[PDB]
């Protein structure tokens, strides 16, 4: 593997700062141009700045927008890259990308970390199990679901049960409504279970909670 894993994301309030770090493995980190890009929601990808390789010293380039406010550093012992972001504004919310080789042939992007720069506070989800009305509907394959209402900031993961006989799990992206997030997931299962054996959704919202809810009835 040639890993590059990004890590300082989360919620910051406006005017605040955050240290983003990028971990790498399986190549000579000193050899490569190391770059930070971001994608705001909606918008196109936006390059923020790179740092050169030992050849070139480890000299840095930055875009007009972030120069003086963001700063890229490098540690070549641990083989961590950093992006110190200051005086963060709401427009700085985005998925941020760590990248090896900007200029072509050895390209490798990590998967992003999400920052929300906002003045709202963390809200854990209320999780509801969704089961159909008794009497009134089934056939062959049962669809169960889970509504995870009212959490903030993003990303929630809903786990179910993994045993591919059906289990057509769906994830419906979160939508903001009245300043909180809401998402759902479904699982559809063969009717030979549910009733019969348990299905649970677990909702992990890393600004601290796990809830696990059972589809009873």
């Amino acid at each position: 593997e040639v890993k590059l894993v990004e890590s300082g994301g989360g919620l910051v309030q406006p005017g605040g700062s955050l240290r983003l770090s990028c971990a790498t493995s399986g190549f000579t980190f000193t050899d490569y141009y190391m770059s930070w890009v971001r994608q705001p929601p909606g918008k196109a990808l936006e390059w923020l700045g790179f740092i050169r390789n030992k050849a070139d010293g480890y000299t840095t380039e930055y875009s007009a927008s972030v120069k003086g406010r963001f700063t890229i550093s490098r540690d070549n012992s641990q083989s961590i890259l950093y992006l110190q972001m200051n005086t963060l504004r709401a427009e700085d919310s985005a998925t941020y990308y760590c990248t090896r080789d900007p200029y072509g042939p050895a390209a490798y992007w990590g998967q992003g970390t999400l920052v929300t720069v906002s003045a709202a506070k963390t809200t854990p989800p209320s999780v509801y199990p969704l089961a159909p009305g008794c009497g009134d509907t089934t056939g062959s394959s049962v669809t169960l679901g889970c509504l995870v209402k009212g959490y903030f900031p993003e990303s929630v993961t809903v786990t179910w049960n993994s045993g591919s006989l059906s289990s057509s799990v769906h994830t419906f992206p979160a939508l903001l409504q009245s300043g909180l997030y809401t998402m759902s997931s479904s699982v559809t299962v063969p009717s030979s279970t549910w009733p019969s054996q348990t299905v649970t959704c677990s909702v992990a919202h890393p600004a601290s909670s796990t809830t696990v809810d059972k589809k009873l009835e």
């Binding site: 007009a64 200029y103 072509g104 998967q111 509907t137 209402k149």
Partner: protein, 214 residues
Amino acid sequence: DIQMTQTTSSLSASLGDRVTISCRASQDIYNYLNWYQQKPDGTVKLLIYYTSRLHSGVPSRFSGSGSGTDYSLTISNLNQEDMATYICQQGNTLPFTFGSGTKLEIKRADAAPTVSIFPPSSEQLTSGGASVVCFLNNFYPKDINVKWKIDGSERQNGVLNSWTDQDSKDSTYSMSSTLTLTKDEYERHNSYTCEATHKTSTSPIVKSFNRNEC
């Protein structure tokens, strides 16, 4: 700085075809043009660098070419795993600027949605509100229109609707529709319908539960 423009943000091709997606630069770029693939999740792979060069790993079904201001990526024979949004970025002048992107949807045979509709949980209801949820599953095409009727009247305030991106394994979409109300507005009505209108049918396809029923 140079504005990269991708005319066309959505495209649909059946797989068997030859896709071409354009990128125009606002300044002459002297061939420092790179093409990327962004999957629905995170990931972002560089497919071609310097107008034409394939990065190792990339299938020979992808070709890049073009000059001055105007460039093209061609996918000679579209494969199911090619659904993604394709991006170009100029690397000729700082700062580096990326095109908007073109999403590539796989054209598929139409599939009719399978509707599912759920009553509020005892848990939400005992906690003051009620949300009636309607999963409308696995259909094609993307375009579909759900309307919630309570006791026979369409409801406007309180509907959330989100779709999944195209399915990786079978190329359909699913959508969730949620109507939220008070425990009290809810205790006052009986029929709750979710009426979906889609390419595959002439008449709305409806699911309902009467709350009196159960």
